Amino acid sequence: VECPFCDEVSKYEKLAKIGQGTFGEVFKARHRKTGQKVALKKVLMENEKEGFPITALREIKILQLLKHENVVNLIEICRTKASGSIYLVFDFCEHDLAGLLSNVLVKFTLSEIKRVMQMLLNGLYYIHRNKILHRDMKAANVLITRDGVLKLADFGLARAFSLAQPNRYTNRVVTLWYRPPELLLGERDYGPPIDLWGAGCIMAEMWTRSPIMQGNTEQHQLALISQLCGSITPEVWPNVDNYELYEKLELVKGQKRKVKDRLKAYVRDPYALDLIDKLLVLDPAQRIDSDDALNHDFFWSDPMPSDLKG
Amino acid sequence: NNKRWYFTREQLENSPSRRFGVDPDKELSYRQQAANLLQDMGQRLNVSQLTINTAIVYMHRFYMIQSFTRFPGNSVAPAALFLAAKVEGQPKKLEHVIKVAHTCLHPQESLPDTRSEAYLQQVQDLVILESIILQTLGFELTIDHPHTHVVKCTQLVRASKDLAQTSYFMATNSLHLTTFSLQYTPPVVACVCIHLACKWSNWEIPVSTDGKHWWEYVDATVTLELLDELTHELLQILEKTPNRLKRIWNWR
Ligand SMILES: Cn1ncc(-c2nc(N[C@H]3CC[C@H]([NH3+])CC3)ncc2F)c1CC1CC1
């Protein structure tokens, strides 16, 4: 069976497993002729009784659409014989952010931290402008190349989004620690702001070197956002009333917004504190968007963004 | 890559089916019959015309690599549609697509037992043939159709229900009847469809006050020489297709 546009994955020689997850199986590999380093991700097939996974078709359609300096490149798709498997092939990236933050020996200047967030928010500008929600922002999904170029990764839970009637999207999304309060109160009509909440969490993590709201249960998570961001009243969040979970689910009243107080002793800078305050807004309507975040005086004050050698 | 799936006339002449030994005219029948089957099946599955058009384009591109001798249209079309349904967000269940595809192809025959070896086979055959389409297409599944570029023109050049909808009909039939999808890009085909729809309604879109024609706002590559040549081609095969023009024909 002739097949021109889908090469055998044997053209890449394997090297080593480079990470566990939902995806499961990601290898590093070397192009057998040029020595180009890639990452090979197998298409999971754990008893699929409806042919090729529709989730895979969605992920593939998205990776083909999104081509931008700060989003991970899908090079091509590869196969492996008949009598049958499929691998996604990505331009290889040396590090992830959780690996560098969790290393005590790597250290970031204020100028270096800026350039990270400038690349991350520009990547999120690009995808939301292209009508795509990531829906799984965390430190582990922020890859940085050898050069120092940030690249967003793992579009497994990603989807397209519409302008409009009231939307009805999936609620079980984002890793619990980076989930917005919209979703933890049952919101099915969300959009770009859910990823910006995750960025705010990631920002703070640049200084704290560890995820800031490590909630065990979902109630724990929601009472722990209540602690940092203050309570969820309808004054702070107009028409939160009309959530169903708002009434039944326990919700701490006497809780002031203590977000800049608690992060003083990690992030010294006054602009960075103010940016994290505008990303960790409870109300998505009052939460800062991709474009306004890049315009914020954090990215335009001394010391300015700089390339990533340290 | 932008000209991977677009071909010269001589490339279409010496195709995979020509190589195995299938007449040029005979190689249009199996294309038009696949489109005809995708339409029949899709109608019954309640997928949108979009999904069917995506499936027709997969099919058209599929046989630019593979041969009809090696892969019958009646095997491929249920797979190509099954895939188009999932890609376009109207996924239909595998057993439902098989079941439907059976009653189109075998109107009188009742279905096999779903416990049987013959059914369990033909289910696995569809799944296998889906993977074979994917790899042939190189996973390039996002198809742009001429129907998007119809509205760019017809609403903004301002012409009735009768003209607006006629131009869709042409675009839908250009996938069924021609191999324009494999030659001219979607916005070019959209111009051919509106040009023909204007000839069929005795409509005369005027010369814009610049000294300009309507098609230059849709795609600046297009000339009249080309539209007159391709509207001629599309109108011929519509006359040969029985009962198709009667849908758009004016009885008063
Ligand atoms: C899930 N996914 N999808 C594509 C990639 C992916 N990962 C890399 N490099 C990894 C080296 C090990 C570090 N611990 C993480 C980054 N480069 C390119 C990729 F596409 C990944 C990262 C998987 C290794 C976790």
DSSP letter string, chain B? -TTSS---HHHHHT-HHHHHT--TTHHHHHHHHHHHHHHHHHHHHT--HHHHHHHHHHHHHHTTTS-TTTS-HHHHHHHHHHHHHHHTT----HHHHHHHHHHHH-SSSPPPPTTSHHHHHHHHHHHHHHHHHHHHHTT------THHHHHHHHTTTT--HHHHHHHHHHHHHHHHH--GGGTS-HHHHHHHHHHHHHHHHT-----BTTTB-GGGGT-TT--HHHHHHHHHHHHHHHHHSTTTGGGG----
Q: Tell whether A220 and A174 lie within a shared domain.
A: yes
Q: Tell whether A142 and A48 lie within a shared domain.
A: no
Residues 98-117 of A with CB under 8 A from B: none
DSSP state of A141: T
Domain span at residue A2 reads 1-94
What residue spans define the domains of chain B? 1-142, 143-252
Q: Do A51 and B130 touch (CB under 8 A)?
A: yes
What is the three-class DSSP state of A270? helix
Q: Which of B87, B120, B106 is nearest to B37 (CA)?
A: B106
Residue with the nearest Cα to atom 18 of ligand 1?
A92
Residues with Cβ within 8 Å of residue B232, at least 6 apart in sequence: none
Q: Do A5 and B83 touch (CB under 8 A)?
A: no
Q: Tell whether A197 and A240 lie within a shared domain.
A: yes
B64 touches chain A (CB under 8 A): no
Token pair in block for residue A76: 């091509």
Which CATH number, 3.40.190.10, 1.10.472.10, 1.20.1740.10, 1.10.287.110, labels domain B143-252?
1.10.472.10
Which domain CATH number covers A46?
3.30.200.20
- Overall resolution, Å: 3.2
**CA distances for B216 relative to A19, B152, B197, angstroms:** 52, 12, 17
Q: Which of A64, A67, A53, A65 is nearest to A22 (CA)?
A: A53
Q: For chain A, how many structural domains are there in total?
A: 2
Candidate from B91, B132, B141 with C-beta closest to A61:
B141
Q: Which of A216, A219, A213 is nearest to A252 (CA)?
A: A219
Distance from C-alpha of B47 to C-alpha of B193, rounded to nearest angstrom: 23
Token pair in block for residue B39: 């339409």
Report chain A's terminal Cα–Cα distance, integer Å: 50
**CA distances for A137 relative to A123, A132, A174, A189, B130, angstroms:** 12, 13, 7, 18, 33
Distance from C-alpha of A105 to C-alpha of A208, rounded to nearest angstrom: 14
Q: Tell whether A61 and A105 lie within a shared domain.
A: no
Q: Which of A136, A138, A139, A148 is nearest to A93 (CA)?
A: A148
Q: Tell whether A112 and A205 lie within a shared domain.
A: yes
Which domain CATH number covers A230?
1.10.510.10
Q: What is the CA radius of gyration of chain A?
A: 21
Q: Mark which of A44, A70, A94 sits at the end of a domain.
A: A94
- For residues A181 and A232, the answer to whether their CB atoms sit within 8 Å is yes
Q: Tell whether A58 and A115 lie within a shared domain.
A: no
Per DSSP (E only), the strands in chain A are 12-19, 26-31, 37-42, 74-79, 86-91, 95-96, 132-133, 142-144, 150-152, 159-160
Q: Say how far residue B4 (Cα) sits from the centre of its chain.
A: 18
Active-site residue, from A136, A147, A269, A307:
A136
DSSP state of A139: S
Q: Tell whether A56 and A163 lie within a shared domain.
A: no
Q: Tell whether A119 and A135 lie within a shared domain.
A: yes
Burial of A11 (0-12, 13-18, 19+ CB in 10 A): middle
Q: Give the phi and the psi of residue A154 in degrees, each rounded to 5.
A: 50, 85
Q: Tell whether A146 and A83 lie within a shared domain.
A: no
Q: Mark which of A49, A70, A94 sits at the end of a domain.
A: A94
Q: Tell whether A163 and A273 lie within a shared domain.
A: yes
Question: Which residue in chain A is spatially nearest to B79 when comparing CA positions?
Answer: A51
* Residues with a CB atom less than 6 Å from ligand 1: A 18-19, 21, 23, 26, 39, 41, 72, 90, 92-93, 96, 99, 143, 153-154
Asked if CATH classification 1.10.472.10 holds for the domain at B1-142, the reply, yes or no, is: yes
Q: Tell whether A174 and A100 lie within a shared domain.
A: yes
**CA distances for B79 relative to A97, A161, B34, B84, angstroms:** 42, 28, 11, 9
Distance from C-alpha of B134 to C-alpha of B244, rounded to nearest angstrom: 32
Q: Tell whether A73 and A101 lie within a shared domain.
A: no
